[model samples]
Target: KPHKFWNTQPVVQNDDSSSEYSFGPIEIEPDSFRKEIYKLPDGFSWFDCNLWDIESQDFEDTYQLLKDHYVEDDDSQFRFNYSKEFLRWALCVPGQKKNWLVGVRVNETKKMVGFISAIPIKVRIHNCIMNTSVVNFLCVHKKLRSKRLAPVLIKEITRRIRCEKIFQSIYTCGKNITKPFTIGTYWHRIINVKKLLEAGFIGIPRNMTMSSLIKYHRIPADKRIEGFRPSVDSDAEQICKLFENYFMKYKDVSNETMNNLINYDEINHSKELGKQAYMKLDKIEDLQDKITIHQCFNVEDVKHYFTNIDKVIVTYVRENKNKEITDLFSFFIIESTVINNERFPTINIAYSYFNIANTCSLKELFNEMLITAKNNNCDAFNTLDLMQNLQVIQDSKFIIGTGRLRYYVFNWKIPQISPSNVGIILF
Candidate 1:
């Protein structure tokens, strides 16, 4: 049956210039009571509040937090920071569709309070085929918690998409929050024993020594740690072998026995195809020598990456010698923005992925990437609430004090696994 509200035109009032912010079908203008709402510092204002290419001015403010919050280094293969030219190309590409990339200012101040973005997805689920909107990077400032503005922003955004008359559903990945949406996936993994212990995640009994946990898990207890390096042409074969042996086994293993064994070979033989990607890393003796993983991403570059991979960045990591390529942790930024119109771009999902070993250290990568993202002028970054990688993300520097949650459209309505579940999509 055709949706009754599919082609509804957005309600726009000429008398509402003060509330003039509208994108696609969403009405995200400032609140009528914003003066009495919450006001941040005078200089703080939400700058990038529309569906346009992120500009240089926006990049300056965005990168500050991102630099410290995102985790990635320049030498890392996945470049997350792109120049404006790249962003323009990515957004203005031919045959791209229009979604929304909306940002919000906190108050009269320059601080950006809330952010919500979306992209188009042509999905085919079991006998269901349709175009859908995938929401990405919905965040509120840490200073402004418990306001419930995020839901308002999301609803408005979805409403706007509904007006576009092209998409039939909307989807997203979010932290655990009160919900009217179905649970898609639960991320689970173990990165650091010390942090996990602190968080009360010590798997074994309280008496279990750190060394015993490492030994029992078959994880290396004394190997030196280092940053991730791209797999050089010479190292691809070995890296692939390492990934196949140690990484593939647990690529999609149920969370149940992931920590119980370390049979890299046995796991590799039975793992699924097209489920994981491997990287090459160089080990450093001193922590000071660790390389920071950063990317110069532009919208165009990101689009290219996505087109080539049919995915967005899921998790990027720095390689550690003790850990196999797949074991070395990284961040995954799923592309929630879909290109349906050449004039504007919308993003859907923003999240991270990590291995059991690098879970705790994953924040460092996020901090670096946040900086890179700001440098590239992104509206926001998003992720899902799963165990393997959620705890670290929850503790990330980008953790806005409040939660902004929503749903994701698989095959645009029909439920099925997404390419993201298997690490195939790049965000």
Candidate 2:
């Protein structure tokens, strides 16, 4: 099911033969490259969005373009909305050029419509790490959906990426984007079953009553993770340490698939928890919320993330009695304006962010989160099948989401990984 455009690109083919190779870029002829932007359709103009230019009226334009036209369901019931802070924070990478923030504008109205972004990262596929572009935020106006704008945006971004002396990039695709690797699916841990059922996300069989459904998913009125509290600037170092310390040091496994590869094949897994988890989550399909690699963020990046946004992301940390850090957990909130329902205006959704447990367990801890999201007015909670979350799902009351999400690297080939091996979270 390859598109005419994607099949022509140099990415790893969507099949099992891809897993046979070592790792690297697909094509590498950079000395002579496309020296300019790809030409757009008539009346369309291309420009690099200046997100750092905070003083302009174009600020709202960026969000509105993505807000209306970004990833959504088949009938457009849900659209992923990036917090204003996130577009810039997540958009800016280690060696980013202002021009790398590519966009398309309507020449007549001067309205912003299309966009794609790239950030530099060292993607470690097993032991082979490559200097690749973390490509994401690809969007096109709904009006221009049939103009083949996505391919143009992709080619333009890939051209710019190569201009930076980089020849490869990494991105994940849904069933819609392309196929396949490291299967991750979204699972909802429903909070307000009444609203969710009314919103059509929850369906009760003939035997079930609305009252029973509500009672079944009920959580506590007062909840807390014993020593955990809002993660702050002081917690940055410890946060990064816990993530790096555990994911890196705990590398000795009996069976390592090519994704983690201490040993290969045989349906090998890391038995950690979630691929993006000890407890983790993401939006499935068409490239919005796939976790990549870990250990890249600095202390500043960590602080700027959770500390700045009290409502959008709630991060907590716990230090053991010996003053040694023991638990770190976080869940991010994103509100969805319910387009399909008139009774419910918006649904406050809590997505499982990142959670780690060294000495602590996640059973009572997960229930604590269900209670937290419920008290916070979150209509529902969601996460993916990565890390060690499978053990808790039976008791945690999570229902499976409809689709599967796969991770793909642009212009590079990699073997399949399990849900437990992927630990990087993308904004």
Candidate 3:
């Protein structure tokens, strides 16, 4: 029972030219909520809602482009902002917890409706020993979508995380909305297959023929695959045994699976995990050869390849090795995005980790990460239900743009068994 939202806090407030602008810690004065926060409505508004801190600058101008659009292009071994001097040493470290960041103001305008953020993971499952918060970036505001205000901003951020009890349970990763709870399985991938078979993926079976299932999954139509270097430390135990045999046969990637796969092989056989996995595989091979193929926005080109780069780009790939890197066939482009009123540039791949280092074939690492995500401009690529990478992203010419149903709600009333006995809690 020693896990309570990792000990919780952050509810500050102060600016009171007169009053009414109060919330938590205290220090107010952004013109005391300027007349009910700009009288919202009519294309509403709300800006800079607080509590992000990595030593503020309005939390680095509201999470420097959403953490360089979902951190991957490493920055000295990425840590994703928590600085208040590392939240004063992660609020006393020790098995860590106490994470928070909740913003709101979408009523009178000023643009700050990024409703939530939490992280803690301390599972035990089946035998019931919880801690799991894991809820991240719950955004809202496309004209406040169907106006239910995302379950009143997720019950006022889970009532300030049940007044800091250090989490018992609460997880999320949603899309087809379902109010305040119920949703899990955060796995996905598709990286572009003719734009997901022109967006209709009816789970193939009209006598299958997406080029005969990419020639019965031997996969490769030669789109010129080969370009992406810098991955060593002898490629970390063959890239963690090819992401633990591709997420133990296909997908269900991570929910702390004993700290992402048996404590990453007990911290890759300890002893400083081969100098920290060779400085995070040579800073993700120098941010995958300084990526920059854009369309809408490339998270400032992954924040200029992790600013003063020291090493960190945890993952992103497109390969071709021959003559041993275990005869390479790797393909993992975890988290990616482009959407912003799309006209093309609809990338959303998350096919959690891969590697066919036993002489390629997972349809040749999914058509070489779908023609390197369509030559990097990604005119379309999304994969949520991932049935074996939708048998080649639904046979290309992509399209399927609506289907996100994954649910689970367990605060443990008895549930805990492992080696994948499947207990659900997948965020």
Model 2, which residues run further than 4 Å from truth?
15-21, 53-55, 92-96, 176-178, 220-225, 252-295, 306-308
Give the Cα-based TM-score of candidate 1 against the true structure: 0.38
Candidate order (TM-score): 2, 1, 3
Which ten contiguous residues of candidate 2 have the minimum total lDDT?
A: 273-282
Q: lDDT of candidate 2 vs native? A: 0.65
Q: What would the per-residue lDDT of candidate 2 be over residues 343-386, giving only the tens digit for each residue?
A: 56677788887777765676556666666667678888888767
Which candidate should be chosen as best, given TM-score against the real structure? 2
Clashes of 2: 11
The alpha-carbon lDDT assigned to residue 410 of candidate 2 equals 66
Looking at model 1, which ten-residue stretch has the lowest summed lDDT?
286-295
lDDT, residue 110, candidate 3? 44
Q: What is the lDDT of residue 86 in candidate 3?
A: 25
Model 3 TM-score (2 dp): 0.24
